């Protein structure tokens, strides 16, 4: 109890490879090297985050406008 880390977590299975727009996303942030192949993550309004690679393409336009999420407590 209270040993491991609740948030953060590891990579995901289904990333945001689709054409997810900014209307659904709020912020993006790179993850650890657990992915072992460009690990990226995002933030949505639903009250959660989304997994991604890093330089997929649609991330650039998202990160070009948005930036690395501040703090580390949701």
Curated annotation (Swiss-Prot):
GO terms for biological process: antimicrobial humoral immune response mediated by antimicrobial peptide; chemokine-mediated signaling pathway; chemotaxis; eosinophil chemotaxis; inflammatory response; intracellular calcium ion homeostasis; positive regulation of cell migration; positive regulation of cytosolic calcium ion concentration. The keyword Disulfide bond applies. Monomer. The lineage of its organism: Eukaryota, Metazoa, Chordata, Craniata, Vertebrata. Cytokine that is chemotactic for monocytes but not for neutrophils. Binds to CCR8. One of its GO terms (molecular function) is CCR chemokine receptor binding. It comes from the Eukaryota. Belongs to the intercrine beta (chemokine CC) family. This is C-C motif chemokine 1. Glycans are attached at residue 30. The keyword Zinc does not apply. It is found in: Secreted. Keywords: Chemotaxis, Cytokine, Disulfide bond, Glycoprotein, Secreted, Signal. One of its GO terms (cellular component) is extracellular region. The chain holds residues 23 to 96 of 96 of the full protein. Induction: By phorbol myristate acetate (PMA). Disulfide bonds join 11-35, 12-51, 27-69. Its main location: secreted.
């Amino acid at each position: 109890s209270k040993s491991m880390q609740v948030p953060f977590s590891r990579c995901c299975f289904s990333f945001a490879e689709q054409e997810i727009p900014l209307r659904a996303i709020l912020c993006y942030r790179n993850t650890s090297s657990i992915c072992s192949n460009e690990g990226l993550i995002f933030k949505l309004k639903r009250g959660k985050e989304a997994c991604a690679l890093d330089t997929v393409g649609w991330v650039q336009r998202h990160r070009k406008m948005l930036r690395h999420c501040p703090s580390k407590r949701k």
